[PDB]
Write a protein that binds this ligand. Structure first.
Ligand SMILES: [Mg+2]
Ligand SMILES: [Mg+2]
Ligand SMILES: [Mg+2]
Ligand SMILES: [Mg+2]
Ligand SMILES: [Mg+2]
Ligand SMILES: [Mg+2]
Ligand SMILES: [Mg+2]
Ligand SMILES: [Mg+2]
Ligand SMILES: [Mg+2]
Ligand SMILES: [Mg+2]
Length: 72
RNA sequence: GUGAAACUAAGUGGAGGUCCGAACCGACUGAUGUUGAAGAAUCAGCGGAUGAGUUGUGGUUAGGGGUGAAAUGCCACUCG
């Protein structure tokens, strides 16, 4: 598949969502928790890049994926 | 607010052997009375007052016993 910016966020959005349901049961899996914050951080720096390059794509991507916008 | 929670601000809600305070139930202090109006009361304040609350009617437990949030206290002005 492609490697566009919005596509990487879509895969992380599923990779993140897939692990939340896992931690509801295996909450003591702290090694996976260290991996969960990576994908949460990788998308943070990509969306941080998408923001200052084009705000139109930002408002459209966050709207369909139901993403919380950051203050400041 | 967070990945989701923890946490956190308002509003709604009206909890409590909660607060003040009448009835009601109690009886802490003092005065008066003390051949008393009264064989424990009057007067002025005092405590609890949605509770372990108060009360009526109809019943239960009877003495080498009964009952007792236990004083040897109560059991028809009578109770080691
Ligand atoms: Mg009260
Ligand atoms: Mg009161
Ligand atoms: Mg009494
Ligand atoms: Mg009085
Ligand atoms: Mg009173
Ligand atoms: Mg008072
Ligand atoms: Mg009180
Ligand atoms: Mg008899
Ligand atoms: Mg006899
Ligand atoms: Mg008597």
């Amino acid at each position: 598949n492609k490697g566009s910016v919005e596509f990487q966020v879509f895969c992380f959005t599923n990779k993140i969502r897939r692990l939340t349901l896992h931690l509801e049961l295996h909450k003591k899996d702290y090694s996976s928790q260290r991996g969960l914050r990576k994908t949460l951080g990788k998308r943070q720096r990509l969306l941080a890049y998408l923001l200052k390059i084009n705000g139109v794509r930002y408002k459209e991507l966050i709207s369909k994926l139901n993403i919380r916008e950051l203050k400041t």
